[PDB]
Amino acid sequence: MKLYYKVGACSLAPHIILSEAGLPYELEAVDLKAKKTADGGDYFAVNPRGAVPALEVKPGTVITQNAAILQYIGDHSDVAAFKPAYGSIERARLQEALGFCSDLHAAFSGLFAPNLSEEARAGVIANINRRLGQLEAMLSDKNAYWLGDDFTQPDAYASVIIGWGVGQKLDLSAYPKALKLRERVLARPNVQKAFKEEGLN
């Protein structure tokens, strides 16, 4: 399978999950500004929404949307925690966390709009604080990872999102559970492998 990505963007979550699944996969960096694949082709032909991630499962079949991609990868892995049975409450919990990651993403994405006024930015920041506060309340000191004992796809997604906060030099020290979750995720060898594959430290 071939993952269309941009370094450090939300495609990093499926990149991580592909690495964790042990998945043979390939990687295609996308010029997101010009909407071009690496060979100069039109990325809109791959994803008409023009966003990453996209995952070519096989020639002619490209899945878009992080929730769909993350669960496709999981459902075709041998990692039981990545593929709970539909819906066992576990599947519902998996999808709820992924759904909430999309709420988190929507909040952070305002930060990256062009010609963002200071006033508009303040509103974005307040929303980010609110979403991060909600994430922190959702996480529990009783669980090693978001959903419990096992690392799952929303752990990778949450960690990338929190990563955008760090990269924007935002103070996340009031969200210690979220920071600890990301610390745990980044320590994983197959996570470090994915980072390395995007030329990231």
Added chain:
Amino acid sequence: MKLYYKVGACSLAPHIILSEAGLPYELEAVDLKAKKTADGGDYFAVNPRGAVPALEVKPGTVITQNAAILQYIGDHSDVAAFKPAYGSIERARLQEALGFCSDLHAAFSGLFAPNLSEEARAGVIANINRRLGQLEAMLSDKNAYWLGDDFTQPDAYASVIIGWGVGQKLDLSAYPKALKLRERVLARPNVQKAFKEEGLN
């Protein structure tokens, strides 16, 4: 199961799917402004995110997020189209459309922010047009419903979203596939039943 909703909001999609599944269910209207249940209790205890929908599967187990709720309902129905096998490409397509419905929702939701300046509103409207253009391109004249021959959860979700456009007196006539999809969905007896249950025509 008990669905927490607000009349006409995104909770209408799971309301519809509950009706279509034949599901026995109950309904709890939420004062979204004050974040209160009907008995005056604190809605944040039901959904700490403070949003609808939420679905009590049983006492003590409340699922939030439309993608999770819509698939939980489907997976516990007898409607095969609502529960493709994980991931058969059909499951991935289901989740991709639901993921995109969340992109659509995020665009429309800007329209309902308080103290929305005209200038800010123009930006929201341009995003809505872009998301609707993407939806229209995703739909195919070869398919009776979004994903093919069968009505599925994203049909209900898309129809509610387009409904917000109508209610805001927005011109959607440039999206004939989207309008036809909504027309088809609204004609369904179990959809009309759900509308009736929220006191809607």
